[PDB]
Design an enzyme around this catalytic site. Structure first.
Site, PDB file in Angstrom:
ATOM      1  CG  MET A  22       2.508   1.001   3.911  1.00 20.25           C
ATOM      2  SD  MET A  22       1.180   0.576   5.074  1.00 20.25           S
ATOM      3  CE  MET A  22       1.320   1.918   6.251  1.00 20.25           C
ATOM      4  CG  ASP A  61      -1.921   1.133   1.188  1.00 21.61           C
ATOM      5  OD1 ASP A  61      -2.138   1.706   0.097  1.00 21.61           O
ATOM      6  OD2 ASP A  61      -2.474   1.452   2.265  1.00 21.61           O
ATOM      7  CG  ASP A 104      -2.439  -2.490   3.838  1.00 22.67           C
ATOM      8  OD1 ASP A 104      -2.804  -2.368   5.025  1.00 22.67           O
ATOM      9  OD2 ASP A 104      -2.979  -1.879   2.899  1.00 22.67           O
ATOM     10  NE  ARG A 106     -12.346   3.284   4.121  1.00 27.45           N
ATOM     11  CZ  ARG A 106     -12.406   4.148   5.128  1.00 27.45           C
ATOM     12  NH1 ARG A 106     -13.504   4.869   5.317  1.00 27.45           N
ATOM     13  NH2 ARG A 106     -11.374   4.287   5.946  1.00 27.45           N
ATOM     14  CE  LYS A 123      -0.214   3.555   3.448  1.00 26.34           C
ATOM     15  NZ  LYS A 123      -1.180   4.210   4.384  1.00 26.34           N
TER      16      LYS A 123
HETATM   17  C1  LIG Z   1      -5.769   7.219   5.377  1.00 28.06           C
HETATM   18  C2  LIG Z   1      -6.428   6.916   6.724  1.00 28.06           C
HETATM   19  C3  LIG Z   1      -5.981   7.943   7.765  1.00 28.06           C
HETATM   20  C4  LIG Z   1      -7.950   6.980   6.559  1.00 28.06           C
HETATM   21  C5  LIG Z   1      -6.069   5.500   7.190  1.00 28.06           C
HETATM   22  O1  LIG Z   1      -6.460   5.069   8.274  1.00 28.06           O
HETATM   23  N1  LIG Z   1      -5.342   4.786   6.325  1.00 28.06           N
HETATM   24  C6  LIG Z   1      -4.976   3.382   6.569  1.00 28.06           C
HETATM   25  C7  LIG Z   1      -4.701   2.742   5.200  1.00 28.06           C
HETATM   26  O2  LIG Z   1      -3.719   3.067   4.531  1.00 28.06           O
HETATM   27  N2  LIG Z   1      -5.617   1.849   4.806  1.00 28.06           N
HETATM   28  O3  LIG Z   1      -5.438   1.229   3.527  1.00 28.06           O
HETATM   29  C8  LIG Z   1      -3.880   3.166   7.418  1.00 28.06           C
HETATM   30  C9  LIG Z   1      -2.913   4.127   7.722  1.00 28.06           C
HETATM   31  C10 LIG Z   1      -1.844   3.793   8.569  1.00 28.06           C
HETATM   32  C11 LIG Z   1      -1.733   2.502   9.105  1.00 28.06           C
HETATM   33  C12 LIG Z   1      -0.730   2.139   9.919  1.00 28.06           C
HETATM   34  C13 LIG Z   1      -0.794   1.011  10.667  1.00 28.06           C
HETATM   35  C14 LIG Z   1       0.279   0.765  11.440  1.00 28.06           C
HETATM   36  S1  LIG Z   1       1.338   2.003  11.168  1.00 28.06           S
HETATM   37  C15 LIG Z   1       0.398   2.847  10.054  1.00 28.06           C
HETATM   38  C16 LIG Z   1      -2.700   1.560   8.790  1.00 28.06           C
HETATM   39  C17 LIG Z   1      -3.758   1.891   7.955  1.00 28.06           C
HETATM   40 ZN   LIG Z   2      -4.109   2.642   2.385  1.00 30.67          ZN
HETATM   41 ZN   LIG Z   3      -4.363  -0.433   3.307  1.00 30.81          ZN
END
Ligand SMILES: CC(C)(C)C(=O)N[C@@H](C(=O)NO)c1ccc(-c2ccsc2)cc1
Ligand SMILES: [Zn+2]
Ligand SMILES: [Zn+2]
Ligand SMILES: CC(C)(C)C(=O)N[C@@H](C(=O)NO)c1ccc(-c2ccsc2)cc1
Ligand SMILES: CC(C)(C)C(=O)N[C@@H](C(=O)NO)c1ccc(-c2ccsc2)cc1
Ligand SMILES: [Zn+2]
Ligand SMILES: [Zn+2]
Ligand SMILES: [Zn+2]
Ligand SMILES: [Zn+2]
Lengths: 519, 518, 509
Positions: free
Chosen positions: C303, C286, C306, C370, C293
């Site tokens: 990432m 991701d 993920d 999501r 990011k």
């Molecule tokens: C972009 C946001 C703030 C809505 C979010 O929660 N993003 C997720 C994400 O990228 N989902 O695909 C996100 C961001 C950071 C993390 C994370 C987890 C451990 S360190 C950073 C995890 C999910």
């Molecule tokens: Zn993401």
């Molecule tokens: Zn993600």
């Protein structure tokens, strides 16, 4: 004159001010070109252009009363040099009396009508010729077309840029600091330009005086030391003066202005200078300058990148401009006019005693204000100053302030912005902008944004919620404190400081003065 | 008691409106059987239509007026639907040829209106009260509501209708004319009538808290807030005691005292006490976080989104607690002794301020290393909790705008509750339902406790490794309660209504319901 | 099935270890009554003192006189029971054979949590990594129930094991002395199964995105299915297009790796009485997409993690496929793709259509999880199951709510949620129930699309995301487990393989 409070005995207790500058020792003579140019001691510089032809050859068309110099400056000898704007060259030769003379030229480009910005380029080139050369005299030969105002502007800029502020130098004074004692000017129809000479010298010092105050650091220039300097200026000019302290400020119920200063060790001082003509008063004017001697931002501290908290001694530039205007007016002494020079001076600091974000404060007209940002302090101090101004019963109120950083994004560093509630007054500011050559542009007070100043608890918000157009919103706020008087607001937050040259401009002094005089 | 000023224009007391226009509203409850009289003002039917999403409006109740009844026939009402939030106005003449104003509010298709949905109904109703000078409002309940929810309807109606104008001077609403009578037609009115005055009480407790919170930090400071508490205690005949710096020093409250060091306002510890007339069966300590302004200290709130201009609201916990004292003192429950506590101070930047890195000694002897001067809430609460436990109570409950992290965990609707005792937590959750102030149980994860281990002091004020500051703060707080059932409610996310730009007075009804049904 | 490459040095599969040294360890469980034999290797007593940082005291009789002399009260009181503190000593026993004897402090609380037990095991593993040993013997002088004992073994096995697949001698015997040994013996081979399920998931997670991509991950899933005799189906782009999975397909548009949908199936022999769909988020890398990011703290180099949701699900499939529960049908699902920046990537603002016909306005391409879960949940519900459980590294906000120890569970059904909580208790993978707040739903109302992918500002991201996913499950009990905070062990610089045991316990019980 009040006593300046100290923390340590080494704290300075006044602003060093240079009144008698080397510029005032220069004798200026204006000659007509029709009589021919005499070339002797010092440096004789021709200002030349070449219409249409960019970087065209230099031609000296003025008569020169010297066969040797005339031969040197003949067309065939000059054609290897061009008139590129800002170009300069030094010549060396012997004249008819076997004396060695220094001659030269500054190129004025290929356009006959020089703008105020291009003229500054010409003067700076000329100043580089003055620096690092111990000269007793300078002669300037105008072979370009300039009107009376631009001629005066040339002299003002020459004087201002030539001058070097060494008030805070101790061990690093320039040992080679030597100024000319004489300035000759050759120009067509010289008798019509002669009247501009002393006016320029007056405008120069009004501008230079403001610059000294602005450049003065906040440990030297604080509310007490600044009001003290205003007193001294009024005493030398026979102006009426009144400095209002906290006690009388409280009686006048200036809660907005007082709250800004709560956090400072220096008591608030409200400056009120007055000039009245001996003749029957036919118009009354109040000039209001923002006077923050240092703006830390308060609890909304300037800690964000690009906030330049180290520049914040500049935040009394509005006050400086007004005081500079006071010098010019008290010197030139206009008739049938009454002028008030006003500044609500204070320092915006962080302290146990500071005013807080969210505080609700009552201005002197009874309006309650909700504070959303302690760093938006200028408009608070101005609010009480504007109420005070309108109670004087004047025809015009004009304020000048380093109010909003957004000016740098709207007009930048060259043009100031003017807002107002009266079109006729705005046109006059724009007119004085032309005749002073201090660039100003008309910017709107957009009423649709007014609703974003609707406070939930107070009568009005200090700052907007939406917007982001800070300069316009701040103008909306200020307008709420002027009921029924022509009023204009000059934001100089962008043009006050010369970033390249690292010095103040003394912006607004000539503009305000021209406004006072030309009506 | 004397409020220091920098200049003579600085306010020396919080303006407090005690008797509001709401109190001047005479309220009458009638049973829906026997019909509804429509003769004057604005008559509003609360209608439903279970099933269809936006079904037609159908006025069930009998209207004791031939002309009004003919207008409100099913045929005429067919074009209007019952969408949750909608509303319409009607004009007509009744039987004796008098003009009357009628209308309705859509309550949706769902047969069970929740805390958020009922609030939406009230707003629609309040909109009808705004910009319309009415002497009387009649509300006919053609929907079904429990007794708590009916009380919640009135509370919310009263709170949202009331307008705070203490700080207006040149811009007061000239068209502001409140009703004098409120009529309610509802089924089984005999049982609902009891909720009316309970709603009025709960309303003012909430609105009283709101007034303290909305009051800016120059009006509302440690001295003036504690004076206001004293005045409250006096009107209610509660025992009161305000501990000043000299007293606080003897009690060795070094954590709390450190926080107020940089302030021009001396610390003041608020101790109010209600006692029941008879045999006391439960002793309760309610503790409110009382920072009248939170600048952050030398850890200044300068980061984007830190919202420093909101920090007058950092005494919301104290306001909740004092608001509860009003309700409790007015309703006078039996068999209970309640202590209302708040370590009130102001977190400022000064030559005298406490510094990041400072090691300070709490009143229970534990030394604390300050990692961040902006985590000051838990420092004041520490000494307040130690004081509380020394009172030998059954339950200690603190409530505080303690951590910004709450906006990321539960958001703006639900407060978080943490605790060391499941029974106490259950009572708080139970109180949340009956007060309709939503709370969600969050855990105190002991695994994170090791990050509070300090190299030099007994304990760290903050974690360096673990995020999840709401839990870490709870862990810190737990270290200052030795053997007493304790719970902690973080209202940092719910205390301020960002959309309406006003406080909620969150926690008043919750704490009162907790007190009353124990 | 063929992994595309940019250069020939690009890996075309994920290296996987199936036969670990843990599987070679012979475990014997003895009753503490009758005394302990200390004949060889390392013997460690697990000891507490219910006081704080109190002295070590060994209660068990040791059938060796030399070691008994070492373990006498006067000697052990020089040491304390502070949680995780350990000492071990080498010495000769009665047979003049070299043995190492020591202890691990278990503090002063009679009941160790999963966090406490973990610290105990970590101290134990430290000694195992620093000593050449053929045998470890552990003596329980603390109280532990059957689940916590299994947890001890799983943790011991997992932490002991070292992943060296990308680099270029273990004990052979485990003895355990514990009171009522007989009741504990059945937990041993269950722990071994739970260990590998956890470790297998860990292997997929730790594998970098150049090794672990949508094609090689699905290939690995297939190989796993073949080894366990699970039905398997991999859906490709043409199949996904026909299924109109526009939300999920949009996320992978910008990738060089075609989207792959993993669908594994376990079916019991007899009557099927419960049908379950387990859905794992499978983003192999991701970047955030055009919402890159780039902000400090966004940890873009982590990432690869993920797809931890997908890994947890596949790890569960191993356990379920090995232990073979009866009367259940389990579907193991993952919409696998890669979220990348490209001329082909989907853009912030794009309006995309999910497979249930719902149009979605993309507000942030980094909220891609999501979107993939939207079409996976629609796919899942069409299978007509009783329970849908999804698990995902969904929101960074979980770090601010529950942190790095507890995962969050959201749902539309109380019975389902409480089942997961019970499974959390018995697997000792800590989970906490969080609310799906309906008042926040309005923030997802879009001006142009049927619904918004994200809220402009509600800050409660975990809840807002849950509301979003809820819109794609119309009439089935559904629960969502957000493991974004707990999946990676930041301290140890490795995966936890979180969720395998949680999900397996949920299936078995
Ligand atoms: C972009 C946001 C703030 C809505 C979010 O929660 N993003 C997720 C994400 O990228 N989902 O695909 C996100 C961001 C950071 C993390 C994370 C987890 C451990 S360190 C950073 C995890 C999910
Ligand atoms: Zn993401
Ligand atoms: Zn993600
Ligand atoms: C940041 C904002 C919108 C409050 C603002 O306009 N600030 C003013 C100020 O501090 N007024 O008191 C501001 C900020 C920066 C400058 C500035 C100008 C040249 S460099 C920085 C000038 C005015
Ligand atoms: C910044 C941190 C992690 C130290 C914190 O929890 N701050 C608290 C605070 O200052 N407590 O004294 C905090 C920060 C922001 C808020 C907040 C709530 C609504 S907008 C900002 C509330 C509490
Ligand atoms: Zn400022
Ligand atoms: Zn300023
Ligand atoms: Zn704080
Ligand atoms: Zn605080």
């Amino acid at each position: 004159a009040s006593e300046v409070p100290q923390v340590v005995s080494l704290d300075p207790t006044s602003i060093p001010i240079e009144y008698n500058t080397p510029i005032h020792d220069i004798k200026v003579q204006v000659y007509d070109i029709k009589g021919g140019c005499n070339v002797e001691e010092g440096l004789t510089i021709f200002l030349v252009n070449n219409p249409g032809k960019e970087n065209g050859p230099v031609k000296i068309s003025s008569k020169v009363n010297d066969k040797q110099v005339s031969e040197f400056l003949k067309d065939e000898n000059m054609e290897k040099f061009n008139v590129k704007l800002g170009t300069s060259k030094h010549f060396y030769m012997f004249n008819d009396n076997k004396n060695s003379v220094a001659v030269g030229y500054v190129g004025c480009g290929s356009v006959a009508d020089l703008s105020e910005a291009d003229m500054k380029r010409v003067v700076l080139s000329l100043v580089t010729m003055l620096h690092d050369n111990k000269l007793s005299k300078l002669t300037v030969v105008f072979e370009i077309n300039v009107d009376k105002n631009l001629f005066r502007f040339f002299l003002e800029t020459l004087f201002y840029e030539y001058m070097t502020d060494e008030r805070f130098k101790s061990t690093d004074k320039n040992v080679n600091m030597e100024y000319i004692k004489h300035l000759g000017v050759y120009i067509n129809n010289a008798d019509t330009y002669k009247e501009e000479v002393e006016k320029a010298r007056v405008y120069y010092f009004g501008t230079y005086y403001a610059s000294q105050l602005i450049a003065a650091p906040s440990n030297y220039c604080n509310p007490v030391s600044l009001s003290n300097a205003a007193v001294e200026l009024a005493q030398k000019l026979n102006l009426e003066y009144k400095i209002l302290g906290v006690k009388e400020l409280e009686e006048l119920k200036m809660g907005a202005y007082l709250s800004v200063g709560k956090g400072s060790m220096y008591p608030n001082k409200f400056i009120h200078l007055t000039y009245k003509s001996k003749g029957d008063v036919k118009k009354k004017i109040a000039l209001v300058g923002k006077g923050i001697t240092f703006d830390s931002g308060g609890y909304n501290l300037k800690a964000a990148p690009g906030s330049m908290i180290d520049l914040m001694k500049f935040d009394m530039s509005g006050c400086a401009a007004v005081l500079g205007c006071a010098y010019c007016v008290g010197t030139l002494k206009p008739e049938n006019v009454e002028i008030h020079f006003l500044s609500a001076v204070c320092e915006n600091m962080v302290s146990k005693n500071s005013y807080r974000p969210g505080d609700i404060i009552t201005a002197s007209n009874g309006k309650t204000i909700e504070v959303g940002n302690t760093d938006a302090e200028g408009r608070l101090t101005l609010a009480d100053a504007l109420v005070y101004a309108e109670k004087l019963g004047v025809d015009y109120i004009v304020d000048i302030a380093t109010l909003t950083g957004a000016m740098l994004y709207s007009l930048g560093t060259s043009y100031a912005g003017v807002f107002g509630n009266n079109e006729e007054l705005i046109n006059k500011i724009l007119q004085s902008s032309k005749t002073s050559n201090e660039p100003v542009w008309w910017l709107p007070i957009i009423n649709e944004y007014r609703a974003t100043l609707n406070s939930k608890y107070a009568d009005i918000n200090q700052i907007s919620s939406s917007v982001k157009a800070s300069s316009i919103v701040a103008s909306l706020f200020l307008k709420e404190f002027v009921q029924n008087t022509a009023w204009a607001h000059i934001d100089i937050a962008g043009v006050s400081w010369n970033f390249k040259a690292r010095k103040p401009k003394g912006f607004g002094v000539r503009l305000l003065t021209e406004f006072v005089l030309n009506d």
